[PDB]
Structures are given as C-alpha cells and as structure tokens.
Symmetry: D2
C-alpha cells in the first residue's frame, strides 16, 4: 500500500488477490484447520487465519505501522496489553472508561500498581512519571466522558526518558482524526466495536504498534489466552472500515452543529467538546487532532436525566458509540453507574440528517 493515501488504504489495505478466481472482495476464511501437505504457514485458526490477517494489515496500514493484532473485543485488546505488565510494576493512567478500570482492578489483584493522575499539566505529569518501576503510561484522549485531552507527544517524551511504554486509547478519535504512533506513543489501542466497524453489529478490538518484540509477546498471549475474533466478525469489521473516513467526517460536521444548539440552550450548563476555543486544552487539540471528534458531553439543568432521555425520538438511549445510529446516555445512570455529575449527558453523533438530529435534541431539551 506504499503510495496509497489514507482513504485509499481504507478500501484496499490488505485486499489480497485471490489466486485463480480473482475476487475483488477477499473470500471469508472460516476453516479452523488446514491441510499441512497442501502448503507452510497455516496450522490452526486460533493462531493463523487469512481474513483476520487482512484486517490486521489494513489497520496497520492506516497508521503506517508494521504490526497490528485484532481481538474478540476492545477489552481483550486492553487485557492483552496489561498482561505484559509484571506484578510490582506500575501503570499510570488518566484519572478520566469504566471498562479499562475493571481491567485495572483485575490487574491490581495480580499485583500491578495502578496510579491515576492528571496528565494535562506539567506538574501532574512530573509527579505521575516519578512513580517507581513505571512500565506503562495509559493515555485516553479525548477522555470518557469529560473529553479532556492529553498531549501525547509531550507525555511520550517524558515517559520514554523513564523507560516506559506509552499506549493511547484512540477509540474516540479513530485513526482518521488522531495518529498516536506519529505523535510518539508506542501503541494505539482500539475498540473496533465503535467507529472502526461503525454499524453496531460486531464486537472487536485492535492493537497497532511498531515494536517486533512487543509483536511476538502480543501474539503469544492472544494464542494462549485465546481471545481471538471470529472470521465472520473480522469480515464485518473490515467491511465497515471502508466508509470510516466518510462516516467520521459526517459525524464531526454534525457534532459541531449540535454543540452550537447545546451552548445556546438555557437548560445546559458545562459543554465539553474538544473543538471549543474555551476547551481547557484546545491548543493541544489543534496540535494533535485533525478534527475535534463526534463525541459531546454536557450538564443538563432541566431536571432528572431520565426525563431528558425519555424525550428523544431519534437519538437512541443506549450505551456504546461511534456507530451510524446516534446514541445518548447518562454516565451516572448507565456506563458509570457501578467530575461526573448525576446530570451529565453524553452524545455520540451518528450519520443521520443533521437538522433532524438538531431538532430532536432541541425538542428534548425543551
């Protein structure tokens, strides 16, 4: 895919020729096992599968990286990365997803030290990375659900001085808007369940990275732990991936419209969105994101959140994000129910007509 620009790589990355038949869309490789005498690279599906490899090739290509590994889910991608951290070693994470905290709790019970910190300030960064035995700095940016953003290039340099690996959970931004490896991180982490697959009909995760020893370690764990995705699942993720830039560009454009509606509403308090000049880290946003994304959160002042949630007729009240269907949730009641107020609302903008979405939001806020 050398010489292919990003949108071209979405369509043709890993689109391996079919010998003999010439299929434009690669056939779906469902076989669990392989005839050894007919080859010698493919032995067993948990280890090797052409449809999976094609998706991995595409994902790697999207960040100009040599390696990628896909998993049964975003959590599995994250768990795989955490397994490489030894008991006694330390993980530093942003203080601002409940999923990753569940994993962090699991890692803690295995003896991993988890430290939460403010990575938006030089003071907070300095203190965090002063942690002894620092092995991994875990950056989510923009964060969920307050959408604070962390200077990946800066934190990476500081972390690399201390010998630590840096991972960026790039799920919110997607590789259309943010390129962590180019920013200096060692790993990009994805829940491909969200915008990468984009149609809310398949679970998946991915890690994208450049280090060969990390690669060997990652594949070893995936093989032994068996958190591999199915071939049909990889097919759906890969198919959704074609339209990723078209979809993200639309969602961002609509998000901007919705933000203006929110800021003009007498019943909305704080509005959290990376594209706002008043965003506490806007300069960083301009430095590392090509566009401010499709996720918005805000404080609803009009009463109980459930009343707001009940009034939407187009937004779906449900969890997850990044898909073609617009979604709304209340973190306190839903994802973060186990600075997040009881009335914080999070929007994931889909690809519906922006005026329909704007009118629905406006009716809801009433």
């Amino acid at each position: 895919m050398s010489g292919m620009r990003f949108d071209t790589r979405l369509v043709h990355g890993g689109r391996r020729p079919s010998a003999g038949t010439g299929d434009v869309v690669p056939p779906i490789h469902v076989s669990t096992t392989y005839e050894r005498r007919a080859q010698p690279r493919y032995f067993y599906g948990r280890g090797e599968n052409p449809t999976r490899e094609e998706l991995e090739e595409c994902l790697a290509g999207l960040e100009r990286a040599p390696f990628a590994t896909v998993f049964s889910s975003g959590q599995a991608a994250a768990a795989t990365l955490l397994s490489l951290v030894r008991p006694g070693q330390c993980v530093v994470s942003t203080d601002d997803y409940a999923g990753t905290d569940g994993l962090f709790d699991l890692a803690a019970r295995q003896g991993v030290r988890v430290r939460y910190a403010d990575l938006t300030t030089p003071e907070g960064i300095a203190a965090a990375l002063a942690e002894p035995d620092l092995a991994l700095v875990w950056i989510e940016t923009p964060t969920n659900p307050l959408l604070t953003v962390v200077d990946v290039a800066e934190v990476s340099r500081r972390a690399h001085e201390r010998g630590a690996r840096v991972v960026v959970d790039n799920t919110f931004a997607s590789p259309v808007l943010q390129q962590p490896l180019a920013l200096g991180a060692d790993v990009s982490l994805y829940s491909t369940t969200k915008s990468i697959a984009g149609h809310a009909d398949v679970l998946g995760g991915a890690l994208v990275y450049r280090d060969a020893d990390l690669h060997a370690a990652v594949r070893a764990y995936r093989t032994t732990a068996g958190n591999v995705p199915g071939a049909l699942d990889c097919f759906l993720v890969r198919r959704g991936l074609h339209t990723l830039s078209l979809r993200v560009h639309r969602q961002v454009a609509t998000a901007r419209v919705l933000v203006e509606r929110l800021r003009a509403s007498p019943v909305v308090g704080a509005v959290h969105y990376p594209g706002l000049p008043e965003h506490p880290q806007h300069a960083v946003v301009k430095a590392q994101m090509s566009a401010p994304g499709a996720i918005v959160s805000f404080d609803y002042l009009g009463g109980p959140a459930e009343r707001l949630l009940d009034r939407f007729t187009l937004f779906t009240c449900g969890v997850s994000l990044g898909g073609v269907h617009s979604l709304v949730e209340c973190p306190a009641l839903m994802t973060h129910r186990p600075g997040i107020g009881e009335s914080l609302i999070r929007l994931s903008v889909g690809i519906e007509d922006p005026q329909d979405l704007a009118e629905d939001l406006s009716r809801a806020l009433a």
Copy 2:
C-alpha cells in the same frame, strides 16, 4: 426432554410476534433502554449467546454455562480464579499453565490413574484438580468420581476437559466434578468452521466470577459464531455415534496391520483402565492413536488420500496427525505415534484409505 431432543430444542426461545422456529441472530452490540430491563451491551448480554449457553447447560442437566471466543479462553477464565500461592494439580493447556505459574500459581503434575492420586492431593493450598479424560494423545482414562471425592475432601474444585468425549458420551458433573470444560471448536460445533469454548457447572458463586471475568477480559464469542456452534450442535449425537462406530472399525483394521504396534483406544478390552472406561463413558469415543512401525511418521502421513493431515479433531472431516511432529512439537509419546480423529465419511472408504496408507 431427553438428550437428543435437548440438542434440537434446548434454548430455542420462541420469537415474539413473528414466531421464528430458528431463533434470529442477534448481531446488535447495543440496546435501547427505553424499549424493555436486562440487555445493556453485547459484551455482557446477547440473546443468541444465551440460547447456546442454555442448550449446553441442558445437555448436562446443569443450571449454568458460559461460552467463550475459544476453548483456550474458557480454560484461561477458569485458571484466572486460582489465586497466587494456591496450587493446581493436573494430569495449549500447558501454555496456559506456564502463564499461571509465572504469576504465582503452583502447578503440580501427577499420575491420576493410581490411588498418584493420594500423593497429588496431598499438596498444600490445593484449589483445583484439572483432569483430561481420555487423555491426549495416549487415551488413558482418569476415574472422575474417585478423584472428585478425594479432592472434595480437601476442599478443592475439580474440572474435567470433556472435549474428547463430548456430553454425548461422558457426563463429568454427574460423575461428581464441578466444571465441564470444552473446546466447542471440536465435536460440539462439529464442522471445522468456527472457534469457541464453554464451561458448564452448577455453582452460583462460580457463575458470578466466570461472567465477571468474561465481561472484563472480553473473551466473548461473536453472535454469528454462536449461531454456527448452535447449528452444529443439532447433529452432535448423530455425528458422535457415527464416529464411534467407524472408530471401532478402524481399530480392528489397525490391530491386523503388521506395521502397527501398540493401539490406544478406550474401547479395547486390554485397556489398562477399561473398568473405569465402562463406568464413566457410554461409548469409547472417536479418537484413536497407534504406534506406526513402518518408519518415520511422514512416510505414513504422505500416503493418506481421504484423511486430512492437520491438527484439531472431532469434525465431520477425518483428521490424522503425528503429535511429535505437530501438536506436541514444542510422557510416552513416541516419534511415530499417530492420532486419528474419525469423521462421518463412509467407514469402508476410511478403512480402505487407512489400509492403503499403512500398506504403501
């Protein structure tokens, strides 16, 4: 419902409104909260997955089952529940054992064919006894009822890897074990076209732990995969009984061949644990191994025209491998030990292929 009926109707939840006989495939990752309140997100809840789990649980008359992205993932989940400083006694899974050991789990290997058992369970802080029966690839058998009684005296949990036998032939929970472990990739799905794993068990606290781990570690299967595993499961008893019948035919063929030595099969009268086999297996299974005396295993392997030379087992296509060259390439496993996984092809065609390969 009897067993064969549960294969078809287990977890077959009627569709409201439309009345689908085959339940529709639930691919959605998320759910509308206002339209229900049990389903929140696909990694935690999915109707297609739940229907499969209900079926599997029903096959062992158990209250619980949980499916996974693979057999390895089911095993990893079970192993995650063992705490550092605690001990696992056992008869890949060894790859998983290396992982567990490096995190502070004590793994002890023992001979569980002898009353080895007493010595094994004398281990302090014994938390889990991990049994495969019949074993791979020598098809030795472990008395599950006996080991479970002794292990429960010591406060330990017992798991049986029941992949080789399947619930058609062996019922570990009924024998006294706490957990049945499966690679559903093998005979349960049966068509070599989907990966999966399962745990079947009865303890409610275990259920909570297993699901909590699965949701957090995210080693869940996709809905389309669950559909394929469930679809294959309909014919599990038909397939297994055919495979057993043919295996018996192949065993007679092997016993008559001059280039065959030891033959390993739970169904042989001379089998060292035959009494245990008759006691806990309703039939002796579709896996056969034997020592090839004609030379290097590749000389034999290259001559098959119907058996496929490849790993895995239990599916409709007959498979042959040499553990020393293949699965066990990284215990009584000779360089020329051959393992057969019998499929549902015509038994005369398979017998003829085996004989031709052996003769040259």
Copy 3:
C-alpha cells in the same frame, strides 16, 4: 469423487483444499465481481461463483451425475425447468401447491398442463398419449397422501414418446431415491427441506445429465437472475454434511410414529410408503431404500385445529425435512382425497420417545 461412496461424497464432494493456505473448509466467496487480469473463468457473480459451484459439484456427485445447478429456491428450480417448455407443448403431472402455482403461470403463457393418474397402466397410457408431450412431471412420494409413482416404468413409456422426465425428489432425498438411476432425466429439489436440513436457508437444485439441458438451464438462470447468495450456498453445503445421518434417524423415528398412529383409536387411515397395505408398496420396495420421514393420517378425535394446539414438541407450521419436527393440517394450512381432518407429520431428529409421547398427548385417544 471417483471411488468415494455416498457418505464420503457428502463430506468431500466439491471440497478441493485451498492452494497456498490449505483450508479444509473452503472459504466463502462473497465477491460479486472479479479482476479479469488476475486469472479467465470468473467475470460476475450472477454467472459464476466458486462457493455455489462447490455445492453444485457435491449435489451432482450424490447422484453420479455430470451436472447440477442451484437456485434461490425450489420454486425457482421448478420455474427454470418449466421455462424450457414452449407454448402449445404439454406437461403431464401427477402435486405440490407451489408446483400448481407454477403450472397455472405456465398455462397463462400457453403451456398445456394435463394432470393424470400415473399409478396405473391405463392412466399412464392415457396421459402419455397427449400430443406435443414435452415433459412428464413426477412427484413421488406425493404430498400429502404419499402415493408413489413407478419412475422406471413411466420413464420408459415417456421416452418412447420422446418426452423429458423430471422427478421432484425433495420428499425422499438422494439418500433414499435416485431418479436418474431409475431412468429419469432430471432430479428436482427444494434444498430448503432435508438437504440443508436446519430450516435456516432457502434453496433449490436441479441435477441432470444432458449437456444441452445444462446450457439452457444456466442461460435461463443468468438471464432470470434467480441465483442464490454465496452465504446461502454455504449454509446448504454445511447442512448437507449430515444428510445421511439425519435422514436415517428421521426414517427410524417415523416408523415408530406410524406404529403409534396405527394403535390409536382416534386415528383412521394412515398414509406411509412403508406400510405393507400401501397401495404401491411393491414400487416402494423397488425404488426407495427406505420409506421416508413424512407421514399423514386422518384424525378422528375432534376438530383438527384443537389437535394442532395440543402439540408441545412438534411445531405447527409448514415446510418439512428439517431437524425440528413439524405438523400441519393441509386443509387449514398448505392446501387452504384431502379430508378436513388429514394431518401431515414431518419427522425431525429429536428423541423418538419424546416425539411419540407428544403425539400421543396430542391425539388424546
């Protein structure tokens, strides 16, 4: 598949392991179009598809035939064969309401459809005396009364008159009946039923030997576009692996249910090819290896709609041949000598004692 017996062909027919990767199970070819420069046999999905072709090779192998063609449904397979009959020509048939829908369509385009009794020599002689006879259309056993037609004899007589003979072999499946070996020119299938066997995909098939027929059939399929999807072909092929296991089980259980029906005081006539008193039992012994998994009977115990309501294991619904046992009342359902109280059973692979108990509870004799 030379040297492969029937059960082996079910598993390995049309299964050529993948070059390079060596997949045991062939990958699913979903692509609609093909790069011309990378090959030159594959141009467009409506015409060519490797997954579909593998299924066709398998079906063909089951009857030792050179050709097979699969379709979007059994109806489409039937429609295709009927398309080859010209206005003014005649079709003689024994039949399925579907096939009657199609026969009505063909008639409105000028095809002459003559229905006959093909179980007696006079009826056979009378039918085949039709001028411009192009096609003799045999369903055996028939739906839902399960009468049977001597395929060999009718084929002999029809070929004397220069006509093509097709046998709808859906009820029997190639496990139990081989129309081409009996002398017919075409086997017609709704693969939706026992061939796919799991009630989760629609499909049709034609199996035959004439190369000119092959050309005409494929030309129509491409032009009419009644082709199945690749994923559907995958599900049919996957189901086909267990066809003989499934059919043998369904047949064994059907025999048990037939005995239960014969013992019931609220059952009158029982229709089953396996019964000694069956009007064509001798033909049955001659052309079917076992009498099949379909049974019909006259219920004497009260309203049919109530009988249907009392089943708790059998599903009340149309279609047949799948792993799930099905029950219907033709007068109320598919056909809405067929009495108002005729019941049809399609036996699945559930435990025979469970099915027998469900039937007895429903009959409430």
Copy 4:
C-alpha cells in the same frame, strides 16, 4: 418515517424495534418457517413469502422514495424479469445489456419489444404511437454513453396512452434521482451496485405506488421463487446506511476525473451528465441533484486492452457503484475504444494519478 429527511431514513428506515430485548440493529431472521400458534396476528407463514429482515429492507427502500411499496429480489435481473412477466401477450414494450437478454426472452413469449430514441419529441411521439403499448422502459442516464431521458415528459405522454412507465435508476440511485416524484410508475434497481455498495452481495428491487401492481409483483415473486436470502438482505441493508455518504464522495471524485480526462491528449469525447456541453444538459439539471459517479470516454491512445492492463488502483472488471473503483471496456467486456469508469470512494488524488498514469503509459 414521517418527519425523517433522506439521510435519516437511510439509518432508521425499517429499523423495527425488537420487543423485549431492544436491539438497535434488528436481528437477522434466518428461519424458513414459523410457528403459527406463536403469533398474535398470523403474518409469517413461510420464508419464500414472508421474512422480517427482508421486509425491513423493503420498508427502508420504499421510504427513500416516499413510496408505499417495495419488493426485493435475488438480483436486479430477477426484479426486471418480474416486471416483464406482467406484460401480457400482444402488448408492447418500448425501450431505450442484460435487460436485452431479458427482452429476447419476452419476445419469445409473445411480447412486442420496440426500441426508440426517447431524447427527442419526434422520437418520443413515434415511440408512443405503438399499438397496445403497455410499458415504457427507461434507463437514465444510459449505459454506457450516459445520455439522459426526460422522465416527466415521457411519463406524461405515456400515461396519455394508458401505459406504465419504469425507470431503471441503478446508475443514479435514489440519492440523485427520484423517478416516482418525476411521474414514473416504477423505480427499478440492481441493489448489487451502489445501494449495497461493497460488491459482496447480489440483489434487485422494485419501488412503486400502485396496490394492484404490488399484489401482482408479490404473487410472481412467491410463485417464481426469486427471493433473496435473509443474510443477503442484511448485507444490502447494512450497506444502505452509508449510501448518501458514498454517492456524494463518488460524485465529487467523478468530477475531478472528468477534468483530468478533458485535459488528456489521448482522450476524445468525454461522456458525463455534468458537462455543460452535454446534449441533454437541461434535462440533467431538471431531474438529477448531481450528475452521478459513472464516466465514459473515447480512448485514442491504442488498443483498449493495453490501457486496461495499466491501472494499478482501478480494478478491471464489470459491475459498478461499489467502494472499489472499476474500469471496463464495454466492447470487450459488458466504439471499440470506449472506456467506462465507475468511481469508488478511494482518495481522489490517488484515483486521478492512477488514471493519468494509465492514459500516459510507460
């Protein structure tokens, strides 16, 4: 779908709530048969007739044209065959291809097929003067020269004579052209192309308003059995979500490529509805919201087969409308030197460079 604008209907058209579980994406109904006793209202009997997944796709498609009815098929050809089955012996079809494959069949069934030039008032009048005229069959823009037919005018005139009008709208898609709003009776699609859009499923569709037509269409589909599978319907529906995003992108890139073509010394005529000099430019502006994603041109540089071999990004193969850009030479595949491009959603600069490199050689 009342109150939903077009792009919203793409996502939410036919997205039927799942009772109990609340699935956002409806589950895939693969079952061929249904328990009759499990239904409050008996609507589902057998898959060849009824299927919820198929119906959801139909509801969506119908919604995209604000039409009461839609019916989907195993392929575009099956959709066409179905419509042609409704033309009775002695009646006449007037038409502007596989459709010509179908027309031959109709001829052998006693249908009179007349071809006419529908771009002129003289040509239209002559065409519509046919006795027993039952059906006017319009493709616009046409394949492969992209000429355009005035749907409103032909429909007005054809309805004067009591005939039905169908427009094959596959090239334009409902994003760009709305035949029913223009006065036609039926919109015909190969959903295989841009509607599904990912070149991985076959399908056809008819969209229309007349209830008697609906009954006849469904009757034929059930009897002929040219129904699509539920999994295929799922893939078509899934592709449909991004239809407007894809088409708008393809059109933008098509415009860029037309400029590259107009600048090439080895290109003659360039055929594209968007060109000011286009012989039917007034009609294009009147009935298409954008000029589409198909371009054809006369290649002057040598044998076409050599040119086809030089593409490294465009795929040489038939079909169109998908995310992958395609190129073919009609004379060789589907003047001797005419090339047809189907523009996908790759980066426009990558596509322009590939085209320029191919045209240039070396």
